Symmetry: D2
Subunit: 123 residues, 4 copies
């Protein structure tokens, strides 16, 4: 699913995820958030299962964005963990954790959790 | 804190995280898991904030391991999201998500959540 | 929102959530899951914000089911944390944590995470 | 485990959880948070597995606090999901979700995630 995963994806917020899957399990590309303390594109890197099960299971993957580029530094990072489901209406279904750099005193409110669904159609 | 993050880290479960932090915000390295359908080292990649706040805040970072190597394939991937906190007893405090490739029917039970704390001494 | 929350709700999986919101902030009722190791209705209890904000914000709430009843015991419990959003197509949008009783050795794989959206129809 | 769970628990933050485990699987009591937009005690309700496994497994449980009492209203709720481990140093190991009421546009940033360990002794 290297070619299936490679492409331009959008989530339900209208964020843009441009990714290349390599033969070796690498994900590389750019992420542009339509919300939050974010402007323009950010580097992403991650991993996917390059030899997945043949039983109709999805392809396990994940990636990270640290929210620093030449325009903005939000002192935060998001990881997405999910699976690619090919076929009719290909979608990447994810859960994510967004951690913000905090003091020790504030560490209890440092991490947001959510869920993003990506498809190749911009909504 | 490129130097602060670069090196060898251990979690509460006896897993080993070996990481280099690049100047550009890259993380790259290897993870060895002491539990689950894992054996030997796995490639990790991630990102960190290479210019953090200067108010005592931690440094945000994250990484991914897909649980495939030359020996095993667990058809799953973990992401760690967290922050590095420097000082005499340096720590990386994380939460993680572990997704297993599932059918659409079983997707509701595809993702585990937990927390790992990494220190520079076991 | 006592009135808007009280009633029968359905999620995307086919599960049924039957709840009463008290004036005091209580949620009480029964949950019927369409998946997993579950049969018939389970007791649920939770709390909601009985005096929400009036700026168009949702109403925070949460509840717990322990997966024991007179048919099954799956030795597990789920909590849903979310918000009620009123209007034409009312919705309760939630994330959930499902913990299974484990030995200390298996506690890293004790907790699933997911998300459920509940509507008044389906 | 009714006797084991019933009582006062303290987390790493110094918050105080006072709970009664009913014979039927009910949890009722009060929560006082040492952090956040919290003052004094708040009602909690939850459930636990009242017929657990006898293989050395923990006892699954969960509870909810809505952060409104007579004194304050933070327009939020937390749920804790976890398990009770009995013994001389008994523990409740939890993960929690804290949801704040938001507009639909800000719903992506409505939910914090964390972990609390509760013991019988002040930390």
């Amino acid at each position: 699913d290297e070619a299936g995963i490679t492409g331009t994806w959008y989530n339900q917020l209208g964020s843009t995820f441009i990714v290349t899957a390599g033969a070796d399990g690498a994900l590389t590309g750019t992420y542009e958030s339509a919300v939050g303390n974010a402007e323009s594109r950010y580097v992403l890197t991650g991993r996917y299962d390059s030899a997945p099960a043949t039983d109709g299971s999805g392809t396990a993957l994940g990636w990270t964005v640290a929210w620093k580029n030449n325009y903005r530094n939000a002192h935060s990072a998001t990881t997405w963990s999910g699976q690619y489901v090919g076929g009719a209406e290909a979608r990447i279904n994810t859960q994510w954790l967004l951690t913000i750099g905090t003091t020790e005193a504030n560490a209890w409110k440092s991490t947001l959790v959510g869920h993003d669904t990506f498809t190749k159609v911009k909504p």
